[PDB]
Design a protein around this ligand. Structure first.
Ligand SMILES: *[C@@H](C)[C@H]1/C(=C/c2[nH]c(/C=C3N=C(/C=C4\NC(=O)C(CC)=C4C)C(C)=C\3CCC(=O)O)c(CCC(=O)O)c2C)NC(=O)[C@@H]1C
Lengths: 172, 162, 162, 172, 162, 172, 162, 172, 172, 162, 162, 172
């Protein structure tokens, strides 16, 4: 597992170099944006259950064959497994938002997940839809201008989107 | 790598939980401390060469035999001296990695893991590197909380060698 | 109990290590946040009764059947209403424990562990307690970072019930 | 494991009570002393190895029969075990200093330790001497007025002493 | 899937043994009971629609709020009502699977595994489905040992929801 | 584990004897009462959840200090543990009813349970009350004359009571 | 001890479940079969002595050397013959235990566990006891399902010796 | 694991359908043939050891190179392993006869067994011969008209043959 | 585990002493008797099965109640367990003969064995008889003057007897 | 303790077997070698003092700083010199224990276990003890197979320190 | 395969260690014993046929029924006699493998593993092979330590059959 | 694991043959060379640490990029891993020298090792250099004519070289 800071460290070490000023300044601006990063994690996490539920409710409305008899999300065992996968993906995405780096999401969630769904018969293209739903909901929630000190979080919301897209691209 | 942030995630991930306020408070403390930590890392980096050169001599003065005694493990040859200055610089560079990362992870992974094995195989005495670190701690010229950060990781190295 | 400090120690103790700067930065963040956390705990405690009384009604208005329907699990009797107000107060008191302790530990250990089993056995609907918590979150009258602390633990309860 | 804060929480819960003002004020003064607490932990921890080594060197000087043939600390296996026990005790003491509560030290270090030394033939009275040495050294180091913002840490040093005495009393 | 026959084999296979008279006596009891079990499965299947339609109303009468209250989890819309009748039919169909298979396996695997998670996530109250099952148990019109079989698996569902 | 039949077998073997006629006749009358035994197990088991819940609801009404702050059944963790213990005891009792012998209940439930409650602070005298409640409810349910072939099950209900009393006596 | 009933309970207890119809059907099959099983146990017990005496001779005729050959493991002495008749009676008595218990448990626990070790240590040939059991199976005079029960446990012994 | 009954259930569920009359009648005729099925299992099982031994004795007579030095069944370790494989296959076949379905045999015996013999050097073509021997012996024994109520078991013997052939086809 | 040599070493170390001449001479005479020690181990071990069997056959002749129904050695499970215990004891005794020291027998066989037989109902006084039988047989076999270079092994046979007596004394 | 004999027993005991010729051949090799091993142990014991005194000086000559440098870990004081001569004698005494026992067990248990920890904590350089052992190996005056035994255990110590 | 040398390596490899004098002493004992072991292996090989022919008859004389009794497991047919002589030769050949390898490994792996299973399945009495081995032990004509080696492995076979 | 002796045994058994004289004579000459074999093992083993260290010191002198930042042997973790691999290889080689057969080295060291280095990024061509260094050093040490009974060990040194070459060929 690497965060944004350890990432730079591990690159300098591979070169055997002290950090340059361009790196000390870049890592200082992460810190200066740390509050915003914590608001996003807190907001997404405090609405984890509604993000997941509403995303599933929409997925099954748009793709009702997933819940018809024979569907991959039919029976409560497979429905629960599906809701869980959505919980898990969202959890590792919020980890990445805190770390400023996707390694935790890659190493512990997305790596091998495409092969898992293929061996089970689960359509990853539908899992990608699910991840897309959560993304729009999480960003809407995290960038809500209400009840918070006004400011610009656009770069952070691009980063947060990057992780959702990354997960969605890894299952499709 | 062990940083305040990867510890927070590790804790949550171990229990199968989303992050909680318990963990975010820990990262906030890392973000607040970063001011003092960066100040120290920047200063140690800017004065690295004179600190390495000074530390190497503190060793040769404390342990004169390491410059006159025959053997590939000693600094009695131009190559030996080069290897030693190299090693002291490695220690100094790891201190700055720890300050930037906010934890021991860099030093743990790149230097401490395997340290005792390496010092035994190549007949390198820990007393040498302790003295070099002791010299850096005394002459880094840091005040306030920047010194506290620097000394915390230099003394961390020293405990690994003791 | 899971607090920022016991997590720091747990981390070190798990690996067989002394504490390090990695962990002390986490406790500093707990000590700094404590200002806002205490402010919230003190305010929620001072206004607890009107919040419990208000929250109980929000439930009976949202779910009128819970006051007219026959059954020992409903608030259709003086005892039922007493049990409900009691439970809402338990939730509010746990929020203040979490604010004072700096983490979820109190609520985790005293309320969440066993929650789903209890709600199933006694036929208590989670929708009820979510509405009570939603009401407290809207009418605690907290501003700034004190509100952020309070809402973090109320929303933590809500996720446990969802 | 309980820290000073969770301790109060668990007492209020046993009574079913919100916290009173006497408790909100007491817990605020812990926070206001948190910096001092972190200096002590940092200082003791940064000198762990010299605290232990110098304590052992003195113990064996005063009680040379522990290192004579047949002594409980003779051979490198038993010497290492002894130095380790001293490391471990010091480690759990520093845990207690950070937590403001002895529960971690009691539950995970001291409980059953008297019975362990009795079943092995180790004189706990000598282990107590060792713990006494570390105590004086740790307090001298942690309360060193040099290179720190001046102030009064006397109550903290009494607390730190309390943990060392507690461990020393549990083995004797 | 858990049937009297797969339990017999599982028992033998677990111990590394051929089957024995111990196990064959168990299958004989399944084969003998099958008479009464089939009779019930055939009757519940033949009258499924009126039982589903009747059970859905018993719910809406017992819990009128589920037809007037706003929310995607309630039967206050044509779609909601469709989902509910669908679910009641799922329960009825599982009872007939259990009767045909001679055990709980079908209901265990297709309905009970995951049940509590699903009811929490989508805010579906177990009280509803218990009432639907209670209605089916009272109005399936089965006598003798056929009723005993049917009630054994309906009451099995009810315990899973309690 | 022994059932009523294996019980006789193990006694004859200890003596090295074939079974006598008094034993072949006694074991035949168990078989002839087997239907009644299966009705009782089926009935108690089909109402397990209401037996437990209603028993707890009454226990806590009569002993409200068990659910007051500080009470042994306060907090959801301890309440769930209590409801579980009641489920478990009832489960092993129904096992004994099917086997015609208490060995399963003794060996796998009641043995050591008194010591467990003593080491935890749980009042076994209150657990006995709970077991008494379940007993009256289970017998009322199992001996309900409705919807069943009329007949005399009095000896069976005495046996069923015997198991409940046995468990209640083992915790008090 | 392994009976149809203890297997039913074992199955439920292993999974942490109450019994279910799955298991009760198995016990019903034991209770129904008991008619034929008892009939066989009663007949084998009533004719035990002539069956033991007959079986012992079938062995001595099939294996004449066991009556003339010197050695404590053979029936060439009055004591040897006593031990043999004793052993044959043990086998016959275990068959009746299995019939009464409804499973192999009695024979498994009292005779089969340790059998091969005992036959090796004391130089007892399995061929002998197979022939004794083969004789009992041919001359027990049982018809219908009583014979099927008896033969199932005698052939069970024979497989343990093969 | 599926038996004949669970098989139908799992097909109806995949379609979301109640059972039709064609299925209720088909499953009733299994039950009405249950006695015959139990006679076959009982008979094959009561002669397991002679089925195996005589099958091996014939296999090694016909293929004496399997027992010559260097042969795959030479030494007692490999002979015992061979006799065991024959025991195991026969055991899972009798399981299938009781279940009315090959899934137990497939999932727990035959799946991967061809790859196992290939990686060991065991000629599966000779294992197939062995399975063929057991088949003829088991059918002769199970369909013996002696000491049983007369009737027609031909459909059952075709089914029993089907399982043996299935195993034999999976190793060759 | 200690052999005769390590025994002396561990005593000298406890004193911090080099070995004296009295010890170098004593350890040389062990070596010079090593052949005899190996003949005894080889002889007892090559007749392990007859030593055990004949010992049991005599034990049960003298104490026929151990094999009567209800007896501790009745049923093949308990008979096998008894024969095993006799095998095990003899095995650890032969270990001690090779080592010249009883520690292996004490630590790995006899320690706690009295408590084991008491908790099971096994009469250790009868186990002692068994051990006595093996002793006389093992000594007769090991000291057989036939087919071996003539010489005096009397001191060795006293030692071998010592181990048997030690085991017999530890169970009674 | 690890000797050729306890290894033989350990091997048998691990597998649950009586000893066999496989193991007795191993003990015979220990008994045969004992001649040469004893000869060495007796000679090293008889000349122990001059070897310790000689070895201590070889160290002080090779590493002169250990006699002039300030510190409790050095031999710059009468006590330091006493501790050093003491330690050298410990090494010599362990070599003779290994020769008498016929294996490394004595040195493994009494000296090697914990060695690296002790040398780190008290700042004792392995180079010192290697030089002392190297001196003993050169001046023990042993010839033939007695020297081979002695050198095998001295070189065994040296590898533990390298 | 279990030989004195593979046991030595196994011991070292299990602990992660280089070999030591402890182990080399064990191999020396194997190399010294080899003189007597080879002498025995060469003699048993040179006289194998008369020993097999003699041993087969000792069996038929001790157990005459094995030559007259009907059954594929007996030597009452030319094929039966061939199988028996074959088996006796297998035992004799394993003894010589054990002598050459210096341990039980060959017999353990090629004959003893599976022995009891094979003797049960094919109804082969261990008494037969014991008598054959007893005859070889009495008539191999070996003296001195060669006889001790041969008898150690023949008696090893006998214990495996007892 | 096979030694030189078990190797011949396993070949004769595959053929079902007693050993011939050509084999009894060949195995006798191994024994007669056993002393030399033990000197070589003892000598290489007594200098294990200098063989390894000096080999590494030379490897890194010749290939300094292995220790530059980014190099596969940079950092103490990877340096220690490298020194360990060299220790391990040398250890299994000395095993083979004692056994007279490479099976232990093949089965427990070299098999799969090429794939391991490829999956890690370690250049096996450099590991081969390391193994070459140890070889020359081990042979120089083992064949040192000093302090040993004079004689010809050339065939043994060819064998010892064979094992080193085998390991070196398996990683490259
Ligand atoms: C070739 C490697 C060099 C060499 C070896 C050599 N040795 C001998 C004789 C002996 N070697 C030993 C060594 C041991 N025996 C053991 O049991 C053990 C482990 C505990 C060892 C290390 C012994 C005992 C002898 C016999 C006594 C003696 O000193 O001679 C020879 C001579 C041939 C022989 O086998 O006796 C040789 C050649 N000598 C060289 O010149 C080579 C460089």
């Amino acid at each position: 597992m690497l965060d944004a800071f350890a990432k730079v460290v591990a690159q300098a070490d591979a070169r055997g170099e002290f950090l340059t000023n361009a790196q000390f300044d870049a890592l200082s601006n992460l810190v200066k944006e740390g509050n915003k990063r914590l608001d996003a994690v807190n907001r997404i996490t405090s609405n984890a259950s509604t993000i997941v539920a509403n995303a599933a409710r929409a997925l099954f409305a748009e793709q009702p064959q997933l819940i018809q008899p024979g569907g991959n999300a039919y029976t409560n065992r497979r429905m629960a497994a599906c809701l869980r996968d959505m919980e898990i993906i969202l959890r590792y995405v919020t980890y990445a938002i805190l770390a400023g780096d996707s390694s935790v999401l890659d190493d512990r969630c997305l790596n091998g997940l495409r092969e898992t769904y293929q061996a089970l018969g689960t359509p990853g293209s539908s899992v990608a839809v699910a991840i897309q739903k959560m993304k729009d909901a999480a960003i809407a929630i995290a960038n809500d201008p209400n009840g918070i000190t006004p400011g610009d979080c656009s770069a952070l919301m691009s980063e947060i989107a990057g992780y959702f897209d990354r997960a969605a691209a890894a299952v499709a | 790598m062990k940083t305040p942030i990867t510890e927070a995630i590790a804790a949550a991930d171990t229990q199968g939980r989303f992050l909680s306020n318990t963990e975010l408070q820990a990262v906030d403390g890392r973000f607040k401390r970063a001011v003092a930590s960066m100040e120290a890392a920047r200063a140690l980096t800017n004065n690295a060469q004179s600190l390495i050169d000074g530390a190497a001599q503190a060793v040769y003065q404390k342990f004169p035999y390491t410059t006159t005694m025959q053997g590939s493990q000693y600094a009695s040859t131009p190559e030996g001296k080069a290897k030693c200055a190299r090693d002291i610089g490695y220690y100094l560079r790891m201190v700055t990695y720890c300050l930037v990362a906010g934890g021991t992870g860099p030093m743990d992974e790149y230097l401490i893991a395997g340290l005792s094995e390496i010092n035994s195989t190549f007949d390198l005495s820990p007393s040498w590197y302790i003295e070099a670190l002791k010299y850096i701690k005394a002459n880094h010229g840091l005040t306030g909380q920047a010194a506290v950060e620097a000394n915390a990781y230099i003394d961390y190295a020293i405990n690994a060698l003791s």
